[PDB]
Every structure is written in structure tokens, then in C-alpha cells.
Design brief:
The structure is cut from a larger assembly and holds chains A (229 residues) and B (228 residues). Chain A is α+β, with helices and mostly antiparallel strands. In chain A, 28% of the residues lie in helices and 28% in strands. The longest helix of chain A has 22 residues. Chain A is elongated, with a radius of gyration of 21 Å. In chain B, the strands form 2 sheets. Chain B has a 5-stranded antiparallel beta sheet with strand order 7-1-2-8-9. Chain B has a 4-stranded antiparallel beta sheet with strand order 3-4-5-6. Classes of the chains: A alpha+beta (229), B alpha+beta (228).
Amino acid sequence: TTILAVSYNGGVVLAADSRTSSGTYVVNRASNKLTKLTKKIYCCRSGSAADTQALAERVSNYLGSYQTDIGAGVNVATAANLFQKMCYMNRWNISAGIIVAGYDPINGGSVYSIPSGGSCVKLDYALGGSGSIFLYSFFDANYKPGMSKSECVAFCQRAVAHAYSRDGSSGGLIRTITLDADEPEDQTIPWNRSPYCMEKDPKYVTQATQNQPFSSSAKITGNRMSSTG
Amino acid sequence: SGHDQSTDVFSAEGRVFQVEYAGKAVDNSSTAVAACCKDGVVVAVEKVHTSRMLEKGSNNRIHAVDRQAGICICGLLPDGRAIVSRARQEAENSRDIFATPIRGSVLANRVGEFMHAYTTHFAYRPFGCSAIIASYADDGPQLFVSDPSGTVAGYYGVALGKAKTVAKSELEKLDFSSLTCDEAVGKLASILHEVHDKQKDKLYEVEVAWVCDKSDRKFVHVPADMVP
């Protein structure tokens, strides 16, 4: 699993791979890991699909009840603090690594990493799931806060790709979603048109010189590709 | 005769008598007055002291519920404190669970549903007091009155107690669009001095409290210099 929210000025972008593996076999190829809690408050879901789905629905329900009775919008804080309590109460039973991101009119674009333990850390940008670990360096280098909505999406896609290209667990479609003052813009980059992949990168075209013919010279040439040669 | 013994019982006319009765306990109690401004909100309450020997801040009728919201009870004080103790439990559930200061609009409705639950079942009796919830959360400055029935209603200006009638005439003379939280303290306190019977209740003081841009939208007793 690879997930990440980043905040731009107005709002946030979540981005995710779309692969749920039972280890080494890909059970689903096109999972939505971005899960609507309210209109403008999406959570990303890393770890056991079961447990994040059961928590996403349990919270999306309380935010619904809340949103009705207060007769106003939900603050993203509220979504993250509900999600912290439920991730924390059960922290031993479940295996859930959440990112609550969203927009409320008060604070604007808020992102909360709720990792395993049930910590809850308001940030500029959060990385979750197996394929997080690849991005951390990639962010430290190429991330540059104060991006436009357009760039933050184009970036997150680029990022989720760099991760799912190295991680086995992660792969498939790169679902994003931008949550700001305007109406939520989801888009689903299919793998065939992903911004980065090792297969199409010219770095990795030229094969490693492993096979190598029976020669009369220590001079490495290329691989042996014909039995005639 | 049986139509009025419990709250679980409508009369033939269709009204709960035990709730109207608890409502009579509010209208024989010490007069409270409040005023919602643009700046914030002010609650004054006359405390009628029985004995000359009471301390200053004895039978405190005004209680902080959260940072931004305080109740001012008018009616049976002890009952009112059970309301406050609840309102608090709700206001802190809002901070614990939902990570936000309770909205004033909610806190009033949460307190109404509490005071109402005691007008339904036979076991309970209705609450003897009105509560005046004064919040200043993200919904702006808000003033609300939960009466024994559980009937919330938002007010600009409000009067409760035995002077309610005359104290409401004097609240109508004010312009609520204009007045600040600093004027209001003086005028509400001026009202409670004017309406209070001098021959019946010799020993009394005027506990005032506000929440406004002055006090950092924090609900507190005003200092004893602003009161007159």
C-alpha cells in the first residue's frame, strides 16, 4: 500500500495506489483506498482492508450524525480525533495506518497521519503504507511546499508512482482527490499512462551484463542472446 | 386531582401540570438578566442572600460550562447545578471526542434534551430552574434559555425570575445592534438594582459574568469595579 496526502494553499490532495495484495497475489487491482468521511474530508487507508473499511464507515457514520445535529460543516480535526480514538482503543486488535485529510472553511487544508499506534500528527504532508518508506527520501529532495493545486496533484501522482514502481505490495492505478473550497476533483491515472515506471525509464533499458558469453578475454561485452553466438 | 401528581401525565387540555409547576419555582426565584451583543454576551443575576454573614461568591448562580460557555441558573439552585454538571459533561465530550469547543446552539439543545428527559418518565420530576446558556464559540456570540419543559429558545435579551415582567420592559429600551459588552454590564446591573424589591429582600448582590472579545472569548465573572 502507498498513500499520501499533501496540503497546497487552498486545500489538500490525497493520492493512492489501487492494489490490495494477500502478500504476493493481487486480490484486487482497482481498490479505492481514498474513502469519503464527509463531502470534503477523505481518509486514506493503509493496512488490513477489513479494519480500515470498518473504521472508515464507523467514523463516516458519527461525522454524518454530528454534521446533522450541529447544523454546520465538520472540522477536519473532528474527523482525525474521532479516527484517532477508534484506531487507539483497538490498537492491539487491528492493523490500520490512516491519513485523514480534508478541507473545512475555518482551518483550510488539514492533513493528519494516524499511524498504527493511534498517534495523530497534523502535518504539511503524510505518507502511509508499505510504499511510504520509498517516498520519504523522494519528498525530502523534490517536495517544495507552496505548490499550486495543479502541481500538488501532478507531484503526488509522480510520488505514488515512484513508490509503487519499487514496492511489490503497491501498484496499479494512482487515484488522487483534491479537497478545497470548490467541488471535489477525483482523477484515476491508469498504470499504462503513469508519470514514472522503471520499465519505460531509459536508465534501466540497457540490461545488467550477467549471462556473458564464453570468451578468450576478461573484456565484458554484453549478454549472450543467441546460441549461434 | 390525579392529573397533576406526575410528569408522565397530560391533563384533558393537553398540558403537563408538573412542568408548569416547576415553571412556578422559576417565577418565585431571584431575577436573572442577559444581553447578547456583537462583541459577546453578558449575564447578570441578583442573588437574594438569606443571612447577613454569607461570604462573597456564596450560592454562585453563574457557572463556567466550558472556556467559551457558562450557564446562569435561575430557579432552584441545586437542581440547576445538576444541569451545569451535565452541560459540562456534554461540553467536554465535544472537546474529548469531536476535538472542538461545543457550539452554543448545540450546548443549549443538549441541555434542553436533558431537562426534557425529566418531564417524560414518572420516576423523575422536572427541573425547578431555567438555565441561561451564554456561549461564544465559532457560531458567534449566542444566548439561549432552557426552561423546565426542555424548551430551548435563542434570545438577544432575556429576563427570568419574579421581576421577569418589569425587567423585560427595561431590556426592550436597549438597542442590541449598537451596545458593547462594557455598556451592557452597567445597564443589566442597573436593571437588576431598579426592579429588586428593597422591603422584601434587604440582603442581595448582583453577580455579573460575560464572554466577549474583551475577555478573550473566555467565560468569567466580571471584576467588582465594572458592576455598578
